[PDB]
Each structure stands twice: as structure tokens, then as C-alpha cells.
Swiss-Prot record, chain A:
It holds the Pfam family Zn_ribbon_RPB9. This is DNA-directed RNA polymerase II subunit RPB9. A zinc finger (C4-type) spans 9-34. The gene is POLR2I. It comes from Sus scrofa. DNA-dependent RNA polymerase catalyzes the transcription of DNA into RNA using the four ribonucleoside triphosphates as substrates. Component of RNA polymerase II which synthesizes mRNA precursors and many functional non-coding RNAs. Pol II is the central component of the basal RNA polymerase II transcription machinery. It is composed of mobile elements that move relative to each other. RPB9 is part of the upper jaw surrounding the central large cleft and thought to grab the incoming DNA template. Coiled coil: none annotated. The lineage of its organism: Eukaryota, Metazoa, Chordata, Craniata, Vertebrata. PANTHER family: DNA-DIRECTED RNA POLYMERASE, DNA-DIRECTED RNA POLYMERASE II SUBUNIT RPB9.
Curated annotation (Swiss-Prot), chain D:
Belongs to the RNA polymerase beta' chain family. It comes from the Eukaryota. The tandem heptapeptide repeats in the C-terminal domain (CTD) can be highly phosphorylated. The phosphorylation activates Pol II. Phosphorylation occurs mainly at residues 'Ser-2' and 'Ser-5' of the heptapeptide repeat and is mediated, at least, by CDK7 and CDK9. POLR2A associated with DNA is specifically phosphorylated at 'Ser-5' of the CTD by CDK7, promoting transcription initiation by triggering dissociation from DNA. Phosphorylated at 'Ser-2', Ser-5' and 'Ser-7' of the CTD by CDK9 (P-TEFb complex), promoting transcription elongation. Among tandem heptapeptide repeats of the C-terminal domain (CTD) some do not match the Y-S-P-T-S-P-S consensus, the seventh serine residue 'Ser-7' being replaced by a lysine. 'Lys-7' in these non-consensus heptapeptide repeats can be alternatively acetylated, methylated and dimethylated. EP300 is one of the enzyme able to acetylate 'Lys-7'. Acetylation at 'Lys-7' of non-consensus heptapeptide repeats is associated with 'Ser-2' phosphorylation and active transcription. Regulates initiation or early elongation steps of transcription specially for inducible genes. It comes from Homo sapiens. Catalytic core component of RNA polymerase II (Pol II), a DNA-dependent RNA polymerase which synthesizes mRNA precursors and many functional non-coding RNAs using the four ribonucleoside triphosphates as substrates. Pol II-mediated transcription cycle proceeds through transcription initiation, transcription elongation and transcription termination stages. It is linked to Neurodevelopmental disorder with hypotonia and variable intellectual and behavioral abnormalities: An autosomal dominant neurodevelopmental disorder characterized by profound infantile-onset hypotonia, developmental delay with poor speech, delayed walking, and impaired intellectual development. Additional variable features include feeding difficulties, dysmorphic features, and visual defects. It is found in: Nucleus; Cytoplasm; Chromosome. The gene is POLR2A. This is DNA-directed RNA polymerase II subunit RPB1. The chain holds residues 1155 to 1195 of 1970 of the full protein. The C-terminal domain (CTD) serves as a platform for assembly of factors that regulate transcription initiation, elongation, termination and mRNA processing. The trigger loop allows entry of NTPs into the active site, switching between an open and closed state with each NTP addition cycle.
Length: 117, 96, 147, 41, 34, 139
């Protein structure tokens, strides 16, 4: 599944709370500051991912590629641009170092390609 | 490369430290045994230790063969800097 | 970096730490920091070319100064904050030289390890041969040796 | 290990994989639409 | 250029210059000066 | 799970959101922008949701300032001069290193947002904590 953001009452630039509609059995995000209503696009209003299985690739930035401290290697090239040189490092993110996972970023600039073997 | 099979009852991490400590402990034990094996029975170090007056069997292996691992609060030296003990080393290295 | 080395507007002392893993960069000018000088290296080879030592060795004639070395920009002051995010080459005679590669990305080189010792303990000969608590006792006795 | 599991404290915290809430006024029809909705209805 | 064998004397002369310039109580003097 | 603040010359733990409103950001979007920079961070919005779901009852900067004056070393008898006490608190004591003036209010808000962002990152576990023995943090 996926997370859901805040529907925002645009004109007063506030946020909307989900309320049910008795007459027609539909959910409506309405403003408390004023009276503004938006249909509820999906029935999932709140979710809690507890396994903490998050795609850390998205969190990983390509800009770290240029740093000199990190290790460098050529074993695994960049898939899209074929570049041989890649930099492999660790999560540095809590409750995720329990598993030693190697994250590779291409050294070729302008591609910023990241992936996990 | 993630082929390690985590030991039941503990994390892959702690399993890794336990394996490394086991390797190093075995190496140090074998080294000390080999060292103290050969001393010609004339060494004054051996004389004193055998007599038990001052020292202990582990005392020689530091001076002759090798120092052996060093510990702070009963573990490996921590990552005082960002994941690297000393700047002379590279980030995320676990070499002895 | 370059403008600091040239100390035209950025003084040599002030330090800048660029956190790469997080999008942020900090500049620290406030007093109280602790820093030491280090050799700079740009390529695999160091920037202390044989020419500079030639002028330096002929001191008291050229008026050539360590400050002039700083101006030449081969050596620079390093604080702990910056040290956190920069690789160090232990011995240029042995480390930076092409060999079985370790990282081949060194950025600074140490003047000499003996410089980590202190004023009292530097007088100990062959400290690398003594158990450390003995070194501490000797350093704490050296303040009492009458002379 | 059976006696172990009998004694050691266990909590829903350490056993749940994950959780969520869905507004499903019709019990027969569900967003997940899993097989168990038919069993329930 | 730089020579690994001569590196010893090179580094030591560098250190000599640095100390002969600064001294052992620089930061003490400089803080009070400021 | 909420977030509170402890401030000098204050005997209570004022919520963050009411402090922001007293600063002047009564809207929701402004505070949300100041708290989150990558606006597509649901992970972080779900963490901050409780606290923002507390002070929403208050929406007036003057009301927030009156509350600040309440529970003060010299709290004002009423909103009169209690707003003044809150204002001088917000000026002299609230992060003076970034400046103390009318125009520094926005910068104060931004840096408060940054520090609370760091706190949320610490709770999430993305960023590591600090070790006081790190002389990098000692002068
Ligand atoms: Zn509205
Ligand atoms: Zn690439």
C-alpha cells in the first residue's frame, strides 16, 4: 500500500479532516477553520507501516558520489550509463544497520544512478 | 555480500562480532602457545615466570610474539568519528 | 578552499565543514577551536615540492617563514570538525605512493606522527616500546626531575 | 523452547507486522477485498 | 622532486622552522593579544 | 507522541505549535513548510501530526501570547502587559544569537523549525545522535 498526505483547504490555505456523510455514505475532507469540502479520493485515511521496509534508495542521494572519504570500486558498473566505477557504502540509518546492505552509486556525474546489489 | 546466516537468538551484527572475536582469540592463543613453546629454558623471563615470582604466562606473548587485541568497555574500539575509528582509515571498515 | 589557502579574504584559520551525507555546509569562525597544521595533497603526489625545502633550509638569509609556507598554501590548519570528513595519508613516503591500492583518494598528509605526543611525554625515548601506563607515570614524573 | 515461549513476555508490539484502518461501510465489499470478507458475511 | 629517503630530513626541517617561528606559548600570547 | 519546549524564564512546557502561532504563523501550511523541507515526507508528517493536533484550538497570535504570559515568572494579570512580557521573552531570550529585532522573527522561526527537524530526524533514526565527548562539540 501507500501513505496518504493532507488534503488542504486551498482558499484559506488550511488542512481538511475526513468526516462521513450520512445521506450518501461517502467521506468528505472538510475544513474546520471554514466550510470547504473535498471528496475523499481513497478509503485509506490512516496507515501505519511497522515493518520499516522502506526503499532506502529514494532516501539515498546521488550527490554523495563525489566524496573522497567513501570507498571506491569498479566491480559493478552503472546499469544505464555502463560506467565501471561505483562507490559502495552502508545505511547510517538507525534500525537498519542490523543487516549489512551495500549501496552502490555510480561515480559518473550527471547520472546519479543508485542501486543495491 | 549477505551470505552470513545469522545465529539464532542474536542479530546478524552480534553474530559478526562474535565470529571476528573468535577468530582473533584463536589466533592469539595459538601465537602465545607457539611463542612460549620455544625459550631454551635459559631465558630469564622464563626463569621468573616459571618460579612464579613476578609475571604470568600471558606476559611474554605480548613482548615476543604479538600484543593481542585491545578493548574499551569490553568490546571493539568504537566509531568515535563517523563510522571510522581514526581518520587514517576509510569509512565502514572492520579490519582488525 | 583556494581562497582560504591564499588568505586574501578567508583567513587561514577559519574552517569549513561540508557534510555530504546530509545537505549542509558550515563555516566556523568563533574562537576556542583547536587545530593543527597538515600537508595538503591534490593528486596522488603531495604539494611540498623539493623547491620549497630548498629555500627553507637556507633560513636567516631569505627571511623565509612558516607563515610564508602557509601563504604558499602547501600546509593548512585543520580543526577536528573538518578532520571528521577528510581522509588522511599517514606517511607520504609510504602511503600515497602507488601500491596495492587502499583508497587512492588521500586529501591530507601528516607532518610526523611524533607530533601527537605532548611536551612532557615527548622526552621519553622509544615510547612505542613501553606499556602505556608506564608512559603516563613517566610523563607525570618528568615534571619533578630537578635540574 | 515451548516452556520458554510460555514464560517469556510476549506483546502485540513485537508480533504485528503492520496495521492500518479503512472506512468500509459495506461489510461485503472491502478495499482489501480479501477472501475473509465472504466468510464474515 | 620530493624523495622518500630525504623525506626524514625534509619533514624535520619543516618542523624546526615551524617551532622556531611560533614557540611553545603562542596561543597563550595570541589570545591575550587579541 | 507530542513535542514540547523548555524556555528561559518559563515555568511550564509550552507546546511548539502555540509558540509558532505566538511568533505569528497561525496558518497550517506555513508551519508545515517550516517544519518539513521535502514536502513528500509522510513518515515525518505522521510523527508531527499529534502535536499539531493539540494546539489547533488556539489560532490567534494574541491568544498564544496571553498563554505565554500565563505561567510566567512575572505573568501578566491579564492579556494587558502579559502580551508585552511574552514579546520581550520572544525578543531577548528566544535564540538571541540569530538576532533580536522585529525583522528577526522569521529567521527565528526558520531556525526553530530546523532544530525540531533535527529532533524528528533523530527520532526517526535517519540521523545519528551526538556524543558529548566529541571535542568537535567542545570549545
Ligand atoms: Zn478552509
Ligand atoms: Zn552512472
Amino acid at each position: 500500500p501507500g501513505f496518504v498526505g493532507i488534503r488542504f483547504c486551498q482558499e484559506c490555505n488550511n488542512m481538511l479532516y475526513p468526516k462521513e456523510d450520512k445521506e450518501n455514505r461517502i467521506l468528505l475532507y472538510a475544513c474546520r477553520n471554514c466550510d470547504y469540502q473535498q471528496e475523499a479520493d481513497n478509503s485509506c485515511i490512516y496507515v501505519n507501516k511497522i515493518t520499516h521496509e522502506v526503499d532506502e534508495l529514494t532516501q539515498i542521494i546521488a550527490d554523495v558520489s563525489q566524496d573522497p572519504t567513501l570507498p571506491r570500486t569498479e566491480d559493478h558498473p552503472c546499469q544505464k550509463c555502463g560506467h565501471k566505477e561505483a562507490v559502495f557504502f552502508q545505511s547510517h540509518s538507525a534500525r537498519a544497520e542490523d543487516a549489512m546492505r551495500l549501496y552502490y552509486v555510480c561515480t559518473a556525474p550527471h547520472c546519479g544512478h543508485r542501486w543495491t546489489e | 555480500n549477505n551470505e552470513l546466516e545469522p545465529t539464532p537468538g542474536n542479530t546478524l551484527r552480534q553474530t559478526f562480532e562474535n565470529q571476528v572475536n573468535r577468530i582473533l582469540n584463536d589466533a592469539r592463543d595459538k601465537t602465545g602457545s607457539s611463542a612460549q613453546k620455544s625459550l631454551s629454558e635459559y631465558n630469564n623471563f622464563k626463569s621468573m615466570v616459571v618460579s612464579g615470582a613476578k609475571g604470568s604466562k600471558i606476559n611474554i606473548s605480548q613482548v615476543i610474539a604479538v600484543v593481542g587485541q585491545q578493548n574499551v568497555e569490553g568490546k571493539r574500539i568504537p566509531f568515535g568519528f563517523k563510522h571510522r575509528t581514526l581518520p587514517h582509515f576509510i569509512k565502514d571498515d572492520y579490519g582488525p | 578552499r583556494k581562497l582560504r589557502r591564499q588568505m586574501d579574504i578567508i583567513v587561514s584559520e577559519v574552517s569549513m565543514i561540508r557534510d555530504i551525507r546530509e545537505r549542509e555546509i558550515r563555516i566556523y569562525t568563533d574562537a576556542g577551536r583547536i587545530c593543527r597544521p597538515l600537508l595538503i595533497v591534490e593528486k596522488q603526489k603531495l604539494l611540498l615540492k623539493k623547491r620549497h625545502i630548498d629555500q627553507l633550509k637556507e633560513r636567516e638569509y631569505n627571511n623565509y617563514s612558516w607563515q610564508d609556507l602557509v601563504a604558499s598554501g602547501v600546509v593548512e590548519y585543520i580543526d577536528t570538525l573538518e578532520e571528521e570528513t577528510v581522509m588522511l595519508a599517514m606517511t607520504p613516503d609510504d602511503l600515497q605512493e602507488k601500491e596495492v591500492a587502499y583508497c587512492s583518494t588521500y586529501t591530507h598528509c601528516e607532518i610526523h606522527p611524533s607530533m601527537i605526543l605532548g611536551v612532557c611525554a615527548s622526552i621519553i625515548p622509544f615510547p612505542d616500546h613501553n606499556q602505556s601506563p608506564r608512559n603516563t607515570y613517566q610523563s607525570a614524573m618528568g615534571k619533578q626531575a630537578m635540574g | 523452547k515451548d516452556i520458554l515461549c510460555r514464560l517469556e513476555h510476549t506483546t502485540l508490539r513485537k508480533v504485528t507486522a503492520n496495521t492500518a484502518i479503512y472506512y468500509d461501510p459495506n461489510p461485503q465489499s472491502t478495499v482489501v477485498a480479501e477472501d475473509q470478507e465472504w466468510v464474515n458475511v | 622532486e620530493i624523495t622518500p629517503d630525504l623525506w626524514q630530513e625534509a619533514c624535520w626541517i619543516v618542523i624546526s622552522s615551524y617551532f622556531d617561528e611560533k614557540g611553545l606559548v603562542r596561543q597563550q600570547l595570541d589570545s591575550f593579544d587579541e | 507522541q507530542r513535542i514540547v519546549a523548555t524556555l528561559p524564564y518559563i515555568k511550564q512546557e509550552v507546546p511548539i505549535i502555540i509558540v509558532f502561532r505566538a511568533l505569528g504563523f497561525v496558518s497550517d501550511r506555513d508551519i508545515l513548510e517550516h517544519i518539513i523541507y521535502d514536502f513528500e515526507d509522510p513518515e515525518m508528517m505522521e510523527m508531527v501530526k499529534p502535536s499539531l493536533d493539540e494546539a489547533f484550538v488556539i489560532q490567534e497570535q494574541n491568544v498564544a501570547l496571553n498563554f505565554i504570559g500565563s505561567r510566567g515568572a512575572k505573568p501578566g494579570v491579564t492579556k494587558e502587559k502579559r502580551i508585552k512580557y511574552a514579546k520581550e521573552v520572544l525578543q531577548k531570550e528566544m535564540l538571541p544569537h540569530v538576532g533580536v529585532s522585529d525583522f528577526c522573527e522569521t529567521k527565528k522561526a526558520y531556525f526553530l523549525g530546523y532544530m525540531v527537524h533535527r529532533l524528528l530526524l533523530a527520532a526517526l533514526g535517519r540521523r545519528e545522535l551526538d556524543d558529548r565527548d566529541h571535542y568537535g562539540n567542545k570549545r
